[PDB]
Amino acid sequence: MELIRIAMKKDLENDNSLMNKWATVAGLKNPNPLYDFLNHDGKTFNEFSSIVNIVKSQYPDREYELMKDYCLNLDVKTKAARSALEYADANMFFEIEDVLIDSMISCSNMKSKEYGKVYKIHRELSNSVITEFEAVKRLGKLNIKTPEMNSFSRLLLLYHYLSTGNFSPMAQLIKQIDLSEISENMYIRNTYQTRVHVLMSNIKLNENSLEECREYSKKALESTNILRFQVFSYLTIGNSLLFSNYELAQENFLKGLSISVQNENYNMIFQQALCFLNNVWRKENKWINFESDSIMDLQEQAHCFINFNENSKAKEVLDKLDLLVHNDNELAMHYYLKGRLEQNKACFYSSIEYFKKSNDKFLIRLPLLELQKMGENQKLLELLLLLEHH
Amino acid sequence: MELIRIAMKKDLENDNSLMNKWATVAGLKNPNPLYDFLNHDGKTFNEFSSIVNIVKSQYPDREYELMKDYCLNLDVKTKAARSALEYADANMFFEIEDVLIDSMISCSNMKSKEYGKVYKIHRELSNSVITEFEAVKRLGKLNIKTPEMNSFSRLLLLYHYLSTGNFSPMAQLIKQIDLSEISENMYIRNTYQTRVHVLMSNIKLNENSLEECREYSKKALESTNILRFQVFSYLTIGNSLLFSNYELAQENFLKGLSISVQNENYNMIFQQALCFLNNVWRKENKWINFESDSIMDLQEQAHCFINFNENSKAKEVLDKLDLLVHNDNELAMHYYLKGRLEQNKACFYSSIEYFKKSNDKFLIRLPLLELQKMGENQKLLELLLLLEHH
């Protein structure tokens, strides 16, 4: 048996009311599939949310342990296995996910093989094994048939656009996704819906449409019980308040921290959001990572040094940054930091240029402010706001 | 007998070598179609340019008179009649065109009927009898069959975009014209190629792609004997040199003037282009119309006064302009004039705003130059150069 089933039987001996509890949690509408699940090997529910909700309601502290065991004992040709692939990916359980992909690609079920091949494209692109052009080419050559994978083929590009600061294509591409065409696997329809909520929220953020940003993140939170999606929802809500409400921004970062501090990756992501928050507000900053050579962390070192008039220490950090490769959104911030250090309007104009190229209407408020303080003409600033890059 | 045949026979006695002279002017190998043309009623040359060329060679002072008599006597089911329709429309011989249109729409030849109907839409659209939307809708319901009218359906729309200064959709639209599909009527193939050359030239002008602009206009000039297209080729060539070559720009405007001596509207056009030329180069301007309340004429008054430090007269003229309603491009020039009169950078940014609104990448060089002269940052200027309105 599976660890989850061993543990479900043991606690069934000591408590029988669990059967009605487990059946209502899994939405079964009568407990026959449960009994079916436990008594015979290989029996799967028809919707994956039946185990996940049960593993959440009753063994929440060992979700990973139990699902890593169950998922990797699942026949990779089944619908539950195809579901476990999305479960693993959405939770960023790459140990579960990368094993399923290998088994599904070499397997004899074509639907599983399609899921596997496109999730593999997502994994290689998000680890910079292939370029965006190669990912697109490979997806075309796949001749994708399921509505699930036609949806995810667009999700993986949207995640790549986000991470590479290339925001202009995202809105048109996200609008091509039609989740209603997914009708056989509700778990995948339901998690993909949460994905689209988080992504729309981020698209709104970068459009400087902050109220609508917060609505989509609120919809995302209400629509999910997956920790990864709660994390990025509180992060995006917090970030929408960066320039307006310091304490409410901090409160969302600390709320996201309260459910995720144990995880090293999530711990770092809220540390960085808090670090940028305190730099924008020019406060003392206990969140800087002085032991890092990532662009984000070095930029925050320089931003803080600049806020406190430590110009040579700032220049020293920016000398390091000059020798690192930047994407367009990172380079925009780089020139903004330079413009503040040198009090040089041309560097602020180069920052705007790259914020326009990345199509970031949110962070561009930083160089615009500095040009305002230096007495820039108001019609000129209005002009720069209404012109785009294309 | 039509007048042209009467006159041709009459002159054939005096100079019997005219038969051979006309044979080569009409592009015939042997003179039997010419012999056919004079002696037998109702028969046509295979290509309409044969008789157009003869009329221009030997009776150029009577072109309208002779061609109106000849065209309005054609059987409208014939290729000569469909050719005559385009000949009338290209020359703006509206009295011939309108009669051809009505007779064609009612005849039993579905090809002539289709020609009549889409030229009809072109005339109604170009006189604002109908909106663009109604014109697209009407062309849609025609389900256009011939390659000629598929081409012309696009040309009439480009003329509308041109008439309204809406340059943005023009490059996309003109790229869809494929004149190589026009194989049966070479007269229409050739005149449409002139139409496309001239439209391409004006397109390139507005893009500030000036060497290509002049190439397409020289291609237009070499391809045609139609006054309208010669006039606008010389105008566009001269305009393309406004910022580079005073003497060659003047030479092209004066050549245009020479061929439109007895066309009041064309004459005024070259007068206005020379007036603008002399204000761009800040020379004495003997082309100014001081008895005019059109925007363009008044702008040139103010431009000349500003050039010659006559700022009170200049303010008087701009006072007059303030009480007149300006469109987008006109407003761009207005702010340029105000910015130079008041020496104020802000009115130059408004000038740029409206040049960007009209997708005029040529005339925008005027405020950009003044901004540079007032010490505007070089990276700002590039930014204003690169960014687009949408």
Side-chain angles (χ1 to χ4, degrees), chain B residues 282-293:
Chain B
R282 308 191 182 183
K283 304 179 177 301
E284 181 179 8
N285 202 334
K286 35 248 291 201
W287 302 96
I288 291 182
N289 189 348
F290 282 106
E291 291 75 48
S292 175
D293 59 7

Side-chain angles (χ1 to χ4, degrees), chain A residues 168-208:
Chain A
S168 34
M170 287 184 71
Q172 171 184 2
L173 173 67
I174 194 164
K175 292 191 271 185
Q176 296 166 15
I177 298 175
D178 196 282
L179 264 17
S180 61
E181 213 80 15
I182 301 182
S183 60
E184 60 112 17
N185 192 319
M186 290 304 170
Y187 177 78
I188 289 180
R189 205 224 221 99
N190 282 342
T191 71
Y192 281 16
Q193 186 61 75
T194 303
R195 287 176 179 279
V196 173
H197 288 332
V198 187
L199 279 163
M200 197 65 63
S201 195
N202 283 255
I203 288 162
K204 289 298 186 200
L205 208 216
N206 298 330
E207 287 174 6
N208 199 43

Side-chain angles (χ1 to χ4, degrees), chain A residues 290-322:
Chain A
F290 282 111
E291 293 79 44
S292 173
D293 53 9
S294 84
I295 284 167
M296 182 173 193
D297 294 328
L298 291 166
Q299 275 177 355
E300 293 319 319
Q301 301 179 29
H303 196 163
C304 186
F305 287 133
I306 288 165
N307 285 337
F308 289 88
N309 256 77
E310 296 183 25
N311 288 8
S312 41
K313 260 165 165 168
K315 192 202 173 56
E316 180 168 64
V317 171
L318 291 167
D319 287 339
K320 299 175 188 163
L321 287 161
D322 284 329

